[PDB]
Each structure stands twice: as structure tokens, then as C-alpha cells.
Swiss-Prot record, chains A, C:
Induction: Induced in stimulated quiescent cells. Binds to actin filaments in muscle and non-muscle cells. Plays a central role, in association with the troponin complex, in the calcium dependent regulation of vertebrate striated muscle contraction. Smooth muscle contraction is regulated by interaction with caldesmon. In non-muscle cells is implicated in stabilizing cytoskeleton actin filaments. The gene is Tpm1. It is found in: Cytoplasm, Cytoskeleton. The sequences of cardiac and skeletal muscles are identical. The modification Phosphotyrosine is found at Y50. Belongs to the tropomyosin family. It comes from Mus musculus (Mouse). The molecule is in a coiled coil structure that is formed by 2 polypeptide chains. The sequence exhibits a prominent seven-residues periodicity. This is Tropomyosin alpha-1 chain. The modification Phosphoserine is found at S41.
UniProtKB/Swiss-Prot annotation, chains B, D, E:
This is Actin, alpha skeletal muscle. It comes from the Eukaryota. One of its GO terms (biological process) is positive regulation of gene expression. The gene is Acta1. The keyword Ribosomal protein does not apply. It comes from Mus musculus. It holds the Pfam family Actin. The modification N6-methyllysine is found at K83. It catalyses: ATP + H2O = ADP + phosphate + H(+). Belongs to the actin family. One of its GO terms (cellular component) is cell body. Polymerization of globular actin (G-actin) leads to a structural filament (F-actin) in the form of a two-stranded helix. Each actin can bind to 4 others. Interacts with alpha-actinin. Identified in a complex composed of ACTA1, COBL, GSN AND TMSB4X. Interacts with TTID. Interacts (via its C-terminus) with USP25. Its EC number is 3.6.4.-.
Length: 50, 374, 50, 374, 374
């Protein structure tokens, strides 16, 4: 029973980590689009500046 | 048979990587340790066995005192190195060295006596038709399949840095930095003591080596990760000892690899590994620097830590002109890159005339290493 | 033991997702910091092009 | 009054040395022991007294089981340490700690938790205006009146080694070696058993501590003195037990301190104390080593044995370059050198601003120990 | 007093040479180093002293990281240079600069910013009535008492070459070559590593500077001396380190100064010092070349090596027309020749009107350096 509950606690740690990972990865990939958008805008602004 | 195969051995400190030339991976990889029974044994029908070599010593660790025979790319003890090579050839590979040419790796800016004594043993201990001693960093560059780059080589022996351009090589721009995996291990067992865990002996010194081989990582910013160590959650990891004792390591974990970028922690003035790379690139000609910035190759066992590549990228980009883009190419498999570079070299058809022959040694002596090879 | 093995499978996946989360968080934080560097370098290009 | 005096306590394991700052000798020196009535007493109008502390426990030894609360510089039991400090202040010195700033000594490379919990008790047990925790080896150096030296600190707790140059300090070159007076006592009661004398309990474990405090000496050559143990004359000494039993100890006497120079006798790989001093000096910069060789300072209680200084001199001179002269400065009075170094420090006028104030603790918490002090 | 004396300072890199004008030798000569306590000190009643300057830093070397503030004749760090001059005037000479006109030396083809910022500090840091900045090579020529010659100036900063004829000067024929004492030191510690001696830090970098200041010499033929290095007898010399370690240096000794004549060893294309002298003389008019060949003057600290004059004579005679005789005049005392040339200049009566006055600076600003002086 404590190991069934740990099966659930560990499964919950996987579920929470899966949700936190989906947020960290979605935020990382979105923020990486903000990286690429800021970077592209910086290159375009540099082409304009040039 | 045609071409005879060839044999390749990487001996930086810590690990023998050995196998046949012409294969993508070494057959035998084991720790370069000679472990001696310190405690007198009392039974009958033991061993006796004066000493144990290789991962045999890892299995029977607690009895033994372990001696690394190579320190800082320097062989301290020659009989112990001969025993390690005796173990490679007879215990693992099961070859007669008389039937194979043998490639050895060796580290930059290394004493002449190591190369010259290394050849003296290869001819006058394991009788061999031919051999070569080659620089570690160039072999990793070959393994990465690139003609140009600055190779950051850091093993358990010492850290080295060799810029290369279109082949060639720059002797003045080669840098050697006395930091290693082993010095990080000595720092690590020192930084565990403030937590109450005291590892005082060679046997559990290899237990903190195993800890550091997985738990340790490099911060993408050191101060930021040290600040978030106030709220300990993910930065702590439980580690199981072979005793059954549990170790719980927090901020102590990532500040061990931080020593590569801050040798003030070890107490050495010698600049961090990113400034050493700048020191090498600055010594190079103005023209080539553009691709050396963009073609940094990491090699060796102590570039394996998670996040090293990102930290080096942020620091070199911060120091350098942001006029040019700083790509770092650090492959996974980078641990074995020197051995793979030795496999490809001895498989090269032209290289089969650049061997130091046994005959040429017998006429012209051990001093000819430096005369023929780099 | 089947629970302990599930707890281990989860602990292996907890290490995979905790590491994948720390790496995705290192990526999210990298993207936040790379975004912050390019928030600064966008604003520097916005101000320099200006 | 002006300056308020100050209080100084040395707690390495084994002895509390305590007194006023501004005096040449401590008022109170007593054994750091908490001895508990193991045997249930049957009378009326006893005690009861749950436990006895200090040399009270030495007087009433046979009833008590004695527990050292500090092992290896680590406090094992906190209530027992608090009881020892309660005994120092109220039983001997008769001070209110509210009226005095208190200096504590503490050992190098010691767990953070000891320093942080030690401060937590000093503020939230004996209400005190201010305190400091200081490293043992630097205090002995101050007591010796020298600005430079390598301090070999060995108490009953653990052995430590701190090189210093012109003040400063070298964190990487600090060495801590798990040997002590206490480990020599455990070795000694083990080497008495081959003679038929068996001391099995804590009470007579302090009787072999008393034996070792006078009878034991260090050989100027171990093998030569062990060879002349064949013709037993001066090497035997009669010792009187408090029982009235007589003990006669020959070669067994000088091979107990020999363990410091041969930890293979205890079964530890960890190098002898002269090689640990070499290990510390070798980690130091090349330039300063000349005076560190010539300015070795011995401190602590387990450097008191006759002939230690001569043996260390012969071994360090044998290992080192004979190009430079190896002076060892080991004062008599070296036992109390840490306390005298604490007396001089709290008497220093500038040091009166570097105290950890009670106020600064109340705002910023127990973690500030490491932030302000070394 | 009459004439007020005057003050003279030579700051090429490495050494401040300073004293009164009107004397044959400088009072104060010391290393131009700012050494900072890298290791945090733990005592009370130290220093503190943020940094040490001069031969104070040489005495307390091991603690300090040393920073040369001048590299390649360029001041890298201005506050560090101001501290060095503050040390010259107050610590050694004990002068108020308000009471003396001050001559500074400076190197050819040097950035304008060094001369202009150097004057800005001399007026607006140490208040001074007047000053001058003068070229290093012309001062050595004055010291040698000759009106004509080609001055080969090589300090620890950079190598320079100025042909002069009957006074005058040839701006197009002035050559500056990036080699120095310091680059020979960096080459030397690199060529010691093949022997096993590894000097990794600033403190023992000045130990190889001291080695090179006496042991090193220049071969009268490089290949011949490298061939006789097979039978090692006189070419080896024992050297004592301050550690008490002994160093034994063979062929490695004379191939360090060989770098001046073979910059392919350092990895620079820039021609050897004898071809640079040809490059300067070839840029001069045909008529004067006869005496420039016969009146070559060596100056500076890195022309001190035994046998440089003979090697330059053999190479320049080999390259040049043997129609005319190539005398090289290299005095002993050539190290201090720039300072002596500054002593004689400020003692000249006519020169006392060519000073940059404080008044003329206050009206016309720091840019007037180049306008008035060469």
C-alpha cells in the first residue's frame, strides 16, 4: 500500500514533471521564438542601420 | 592478411582506451590503475598476485591502495605503465604486438623523456614492427571530420589546447593548462567535507570520481544557480554509496565543474579554460581567427559534464567580437574522440609509410621520435 | 516489488523528466536570458538604429 | 569598565581551555566529558544529578560511562556541548556571558553545520553581545608571535595543517588528516593487549590516555629503538594504576606515537604527518616554500610527546631539498597555543570591530558565520 | 639653488630607471610591477595594502598576482603606472615633483595616446613645472657619446631601431619589431616544459626571467652549438630555485636568445633583428650607409646576453658588402644607456628652453606633445 501510494506519488512526480517540462519546453521553444524574433529583428535593424 | 590491421591506444591519465585501428569504437576501455594489496593477507590459496591492473582493481578496491601511474600526462612510474599495456594486449585484446603496428597518443608540450621512453618500451618490451606517438588534439579533430578548429582537449591527465588551420598547426599558439578531471576530483572531495562527508582514501576517491561523472553539471550562470541554492529542491540529489550510505549534494554539485572557469577556487592563478582558448586564438594570425572562433572542438573525458558547451559559448561570445558568430562543436561521443582519431589515422593508406619502423629505431636509437614525428 | 520497480521506472523517468525539466528550464532560462540579451540587443539596435 | 574584557574558549575534542582574553594563561582547563551514571544507585540522599561534566567526571569515573561530545572536531551531541559550556561559564569562570564577547576556536575543513549551530547556541542559549569563531592553526601562529609558518595542529580531535605566509592563508594548501590523540589512545589500548593488560571500558581508556600523556615518546629512529628493545633496560617503565596494579611497558611505549609517521599501523592509507606537511607545502607557490620549511610550528595536545620535533626534522630534511635549512619551531607551552592565540586576538583593538554582533545575527541569521569570518 | 636639478625616468616595460639628471647613474632602479593580494588574508593587523609596487612585490611574490602595466611600450593600465611613478618619487627619490622638471623616455612608433596621456598625468597628477617625453634610442646614442649610429634598442617592452646621421633622424627608416625580453621569457618557460619543469604562474615567470638574465647566452653559430649539445658537459648548468629545487638546463639555454635571430621559433614572420637592421639601413640614403654599418649601437636590457654583439657582427657582415667594415659598438652598461642619455639631455643648457612648460600645457592642452617634441 505505501508502495502503491508511492506508485501514485512517483506517477504524480512524473505527471507534475511532464506538465512542468511541457511548460519549460513550451516556454523554452516559445522564448526561443522570441530569441529568433528578437535576433531576426536585430539583424533586420542592423541591415537598416547599415 | 592485407594491411595487418593496426593497434591504437589512448593513454591520457585515468583510462586506457584501446582496440583495433579500422573500427569505429575501441574494444577495451578500462581505468589506468595499478592497485597493490596494502593489507597483508592471511589465508592459504590466495592469489598471491603482487598487484591488480585495470577494472579488476575497481572490483577489488577496498584492500588495494591504487596508484595512477600517469599524472599530468607524465608517467610517474614506468613498470606500472608497462603492466597496464601488458594487461591491454594479453588480458583484453589477445594480440601479439609483433603482429601489429601500434599507435600511442600523447599530450602536447609534454617532456621529451615520456615520448622517448615510451618508444624505448614499445620496441624493447613488447617486440613490435612499428609504432607512432601522436598528439591527442589532432586525433580528436580527425575524429570530428573537420580540417580546421581549435581543439580543447581535457582529460583526467591535463588540459591542452591546439589551434589548427587547414591541417597545419601553430606551435606558439598551443596552450597547456594544469587543470584536469583529477584536480576536480581533489577539489570535490574537499568541498564534500563542509557537508560532513569525509572521503580520505584512494578507494572512495574513485567513488567521488563516479559521483562527479554523473551528478556534477556546469551552471549557465554560476551566481544565479548559487542564489537559487537557497531554496533547495532540484539542486539536491540523493546518491547511493556502495556502503549503503546515502549522500545528499546541493550547490556543492555544480561548483565543482565551475573550477574550470574559476581556478581561483583551486588557488591557481592560471586562467579559466575560456580565457586559455582566447590566449591560444590571440596568439594566432589575424586572418584565420574567424573560423577558430566558429570551429571550437571539445574533446576528452572532463568535457563530458552537462552544460559545458553552453557556458563556453556564453563566455567566449561575451569576451570576443560579437561581429562574428561563435559556434562550438562539442559532439556526444567526445570522450572517445582521441581513440577514434587514432583509428582513422592508422587506417589511412599514406600514414602506413610515416610509421616509426623497428628497423629505423634499431639503427638510429630512441631519440628519433622528435626528428620524425610532431 | 512491482511497485518498487514502478517507483524505480518512475524514478528513472523522474530523473529523465527532472533532468529534461532542468535542461528544458536551462533552455527556458537560456531562452529567457538569450531573450534578455536580445531584449537588450533589440533595444540597443532600436536605439542605435534610431 | 573599559573594553569589557572578552572570553575565549578552545574546544578541540578532549579539553575545554577557557579564560579571559587579555591574560597569558587560561583560568580553567578541564576534560570535555559528559559522564552519566550507568549503574542505578540505591541509597537515599544521593545527587541525583543526571550527569557529571568536567574533571568532576574524572574524580567519579568508575560509576560513569563517559561520552566525548566532540569527535574529529565534530560535535556528535549538542546538549552535551551546551552542558560543557554551561559548566565553563557558571562552574569555573563565574561570568554572565551577557557581559562578555566570546571567542570560540574551531578546526579547519570542518562541516558548516558545526560553525552555524555553534553560533546559534551562543546567541540563543547563553545570551551574549557578540562572538567569533576562529580557525585553530592561525591562533597558535599568533601565540608563537610569527607572521609566517606552516602550522601543524594536532589535538585530541583531528590533525590539521594550515600554511600561512605574511598573514594571508592558502585554502587549497590546507590539509586535514584524520589522526589524533584519541586514535593513538585506541591504538595504545589495542597494543597493551598483547602484553596481557586488557582495558575494555571508557573509565580505564582515560587511564591509558594518562599513561600516554607521560610514558610514551617518539623514536629518533623507530627500527633502531625497536632493535634495542631486545635488551630491555630503560625502555621498560613501571606504571601504577589507581587500582594498585602495576603495568610494565617496553617497546609498546614508543611505537604508539610512531603511528603518526606510519598510519599503516592503524590501517589507514592516509600519509604520515611529515608527508602531509610536504603535501601542504607542495601545494603552495614555489617562492614562499623556503620560509615554510624553516618556520614549521607545532601546536595542540598530541604534539607534546618527547622527540616529535626531532623526528619531524629528520624526516622533512630527508625528503626535502638539503639546499635549504629546515628549522622546526615547537615551543614548550604548545598545548595551550590555540587559547593564547585567542587571548591575543580578542585583546587586539582592531579585532573589536570584526566581532559577529548579536544584532547582525538577529537581522541576518545563523548563516552569516561563513560570510563574515573564515 | 641654480638650475633646480632635473628628474629623469626611463619606463620601457619591466624596469623603472629613475634618478637625478646630472649624475652618471640612476639612484633607483626597480621592476615595474603592481602585485595584488590574490589570496584573501586571514589574520588581524596585516597591511591591508591593496597592492604592492616595485621590488616590494619581488620580495612578497608568492601571494601576489603580478601585473606588468606596460606591454609592448604601451601602458595597459594607467592607475598602475601612476602608482609606479608615485612609488619612484615618494618611496625612493623623496622629491616633490613641483620642485623638479621631469624627463620621460618613450618608445618609437608608439601610439599618440601614450605620449598625450603620459603628459596629462604628469601635469594633472604630480604637479610639475615642466616635462619632456623623448625617444629611447636617441638618448642611448647621447650616452654612447656618438653623433651618428644606428641604435638597436631592445628592452623588455618592444625592440626598436632608429638610424641617426650627424644628429638628424630618418622617420621612414625607423623600424619597430615586436620582440622583447618578455616574449623571450614566454618562449623560455615554454621550452622548459619539454624537460619536465613547468612554470605556470606570474611569480615563477619572474624566476625564469632571473634564469634568462644570467644563464642564457647567444650562440656564435646556433647549429654548431646545438650539435655539441649531444655531448653535454659545459652547456648544462645547475640553477637553484628559491624553493630549493634544482634545475639543469642544456641546449634549451642558448636557443632562447636564438629567437631574436629566428622569429620562426616564436611563430612570427617578422624578420630577425639583424635583417630588421638591414631593413632600416636599406631605407636610408646611399651616402650615409657606410658609417651606419660601422656605428651600430646596442641598447636596452635584452641586448645584455653574452655573445649578441659577435652574432650580429657575423650576420650583418655576411649579408652586407664586405667592401666596408662592420663595427658594432655595444658598451657594457648598455642596460642603463637610455637613462644616462636622459641625464645628459636634462643637464644640457640649451635643452632647458625646449622643455614643455606647465604654462604652455595649461594654455594649449595635452595635444601639444607632438607639436613641440619628436
Amino acid at each position: 500500500e505505501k508502495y502503491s501510494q508511492k506508485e501514485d506519488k512517483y506517477e504524480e512526480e512524473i505527471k507534475v514533471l511532464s506538465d512542468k517540462l511541457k511548460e519549460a519546453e513550451t516556454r523554452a521553444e516559445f522564448a526561443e521564438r522570441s530569441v529568433t524574433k528578437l535576433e531576426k529583428s536585430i539583424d533586420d535593424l542592423e541591415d537598416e542601420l547599415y | 592478411e592485407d594491411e595487418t590491421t593496426a593497434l591504437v591506444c589512448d593513454n591520457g591519465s585515468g583510462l586506457v582506451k584501446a582496440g583495433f585501428a579500422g573500427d569505429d569504437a575501441p574494444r577495451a576501455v578500462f581505468p589506468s590503475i595499478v592497485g597493490r594489496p596494502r593489507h597483508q593477507g592471511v589465508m592459504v590459496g590466495m592469489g598471491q598476485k603482487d598487484s591488480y591492473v585495470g577494472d579488476e582493481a575497481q572490483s577489488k578496491r577496498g584492500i588495494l591502495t591504487l596508484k595512477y601511474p600517469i599524472e599530468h600526462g607524465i608517467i610517474t612510474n614506468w613498470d606500472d605503465m608497462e603492466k597496464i599495456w601488458h594487461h591491454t594486449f594479453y588480458n583484453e585484446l589477445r594480440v601479439a604486438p609483433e603482429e601489429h603496428p601500434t599507435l600511442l597518443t600523447e599530450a602536447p608540450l609534454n617532456p621529451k623523456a615520456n615520448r622517448e621512453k615510451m618508444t624505448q618500451i614499445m620496441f624493447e618490451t613488447f617486440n613490435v614492427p612499428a609504432m607512432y606517438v601522436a598528439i591527442q588534439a589532432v586525433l580528436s579533430l580527425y575524429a570530428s571530420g573537420r580540417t580546421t578548429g581549435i581543439v580543447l582537449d581535457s582529460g583526467d591527465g591535463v588540459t591542452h589546447n591546439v589551434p589548427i588551420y587547414e591541417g597545419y598547426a601553430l606551435p606558439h599558439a598551443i596552450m597547456r593548462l594544469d587543470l584536469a578531471g583529477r584536480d576536480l576530483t581533489d577539489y570535490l572531495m574537499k568541498i564534500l567535507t563542509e557537508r560532513g562527508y569525509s572521503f580520505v582514501t584512494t578507494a572512495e576517491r574513485e567513488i567521488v570520481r563516479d559521483i562527479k561523472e554523473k551528478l556534477c553539471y556546469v551552471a549557465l550562470d554560476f551566481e544565479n544557480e548559487m542564489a537559487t541554492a537557497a531554496s533547495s529542491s532540484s539542486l539536491e540529489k540523493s546518491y547511493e554509496l556502495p556502503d549503503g550510505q546515502v549522500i545528499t549534494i546541493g550547490n556543492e554539485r555544480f561548483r565543482c565543474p565551475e573550477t574550470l572557469f574559476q581556478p581561483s577556487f583551486i588557488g591557481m592563478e592560471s586562467a579559466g579554460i575560456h580565457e586559455t582558448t582566447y590566449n591560444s586564438i590571440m596568439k594566432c594570425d589575424i586572418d584565420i581567427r574567424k573560423d577558430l572562433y566558429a570551429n571550437n572542438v571539445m574533446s576528452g573525458g572532463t568535457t563530458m559534464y552537462p552544460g559545458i558547451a553552453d557556458r563556453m559559448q556564453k563566455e567566449i561570445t561575451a569576451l570576443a567580437p560579437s561581429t562574428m558568430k561563435i559556434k562550438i562543436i562539442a559532439p556526444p561521443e567526445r570522450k572517445y574522440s582521441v581513440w577514434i582519431g587514432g583509428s582513422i589515422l592508422a587506417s589511412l593508406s599514406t600514414f602506413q609509410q610515416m610509421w616509426i619502423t623497428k628497423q629505423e629505431y634499431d639503427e638510429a636509437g630512441p631519440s628519433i621520435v622528435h626528428r620524425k614525428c610532431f
